[PDB]
């Protein structure tokens, strides 16, 4: 006869659900549902210096921007919610740590992530999930190849392949890498395989 994994706040743990744990070294940002419990806690008092203006929703502070995003998306109808071409969202002003590579990744809210499904939070892997590719292109976020086989400059590569840019997974198949990364997550106490 997937996985859940924790990402620690850099400054609180954010649990994500993924069907692609093998791609963990390519997760370049996190996305929470706009109504996720942790959003208010994770929101920074001010924007980082040098923040991309595309990330701020035009708000003077992260809290103002999140409040406006929540208010605006309430003006959407079923028509907009079943369209999916355009990806919108807001940076919280804070970072999480990717458990695989120890790197800081920015945290966003976006209405493409649904509050009542999974854990209400995802890891975003633009190289390998077209939804995340689209968001990353719209926001100027990094797009990293970890599964060789496609051409990430053109579109997300969603098929089987060989791990690259993924340290102790490198050279594995996708099925083998899924098992290896879950074993690492379990050894560290930071995740589990789930149906
Ligand atoms: N996004 C990075 C990574 O991770 B996945 O994105 C998460 C998760 O795994 C997947 C779970 O969907 P499924 O259960 O199979 O229908 O949809 C996203 N999801 C998880 N919870 C949410 C959520 N509340 N709102 C929106 N979307 C979500 C994922 C892919 O999913 C294909 C479907 O399996 C495909 C490629 C890759 Cl690399 C991934």
Curated annotation (Swiss-Prot):
Location in the cell: Cytoplasm
Disulphide bridges, residue numbers: none
Protein family per UniProt: Belongs to the class-I aminoacyl-tRNA synthetase family.
Name the UniProt record assigns to this protein: Leucine--tRNA ligase
Gene: leuS
Part of the whole protein covered: 313 to 513 of 969
